[PDB]
Amino acid sequence: KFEDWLCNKCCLNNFRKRLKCFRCGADKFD
Ligand SMILES: O=C1c2ccccc2C(=O)c2cc(S(=O)(=O)O)ccc21
Ligand SMILES: [Zn+2]
């Protein structure tokens, strides 16, 4: 299940395996 997620900081789709964003490092809940 690669239900990737969209950061709420830089708006970049990051993989699901990645708990943190791969641009600003901000967690999905931060
Ligand atoms: O090439 C990538 C890509 C391409 C098209 C859509 C999404 C991604 C992606 O999330 C990604 C993350 C990462 S990671 O370092 O966050 O795992 C590396 C590469 C990609
Ligand atoms: Zn981000």
Swiss-Prot record:
Belongs to the RBM5/RBM10 family. It is found in: Nucleus. Component of the spliceosome A complex. Binds to ssRNA containing the consensus sequence 5'-AGGUAA-3'. Regulates alternative splicing of a number of mRNAs. May modulate splice site pairing after recruitment of the U1 and U2 snRNPs to the 5' and 3' splice sites of the intron. May both positively and negatively regulate apoptosis by regulating the alternative splicing of several genes involved in this process, including FAS and CASP2/caspase-2. In the case of FAS, promotes exclusion of exon 6 thereby producing a soluble form of FAS that inhibits apoptosis. It comes from the Eukaryota. Isoform 5 is widely expressed in normal tissues and is expressed at increased levels in T-leukemic cell lines. This is RNA-binding protein 5. Disulfide bonds: none annotated. A zinc finger (RanBP2-type) spans 1-30. Component of the spliceosome A complex (also known as the prespliceosome). Appears to dissociate from the spliceosome upon formation of the spliceosome B complex (also known as the precatalytic spliceosome), in which the heterotrimeric U4/U6.U5 snRNPs are bound. Interacts with U2AF2; this interaction is direct. Also interacts with ACIN1, PRPF8, SFRS3, SNRPB, SNRPN, SNRNP70 and SNRNP200; these interactions may be indirect.
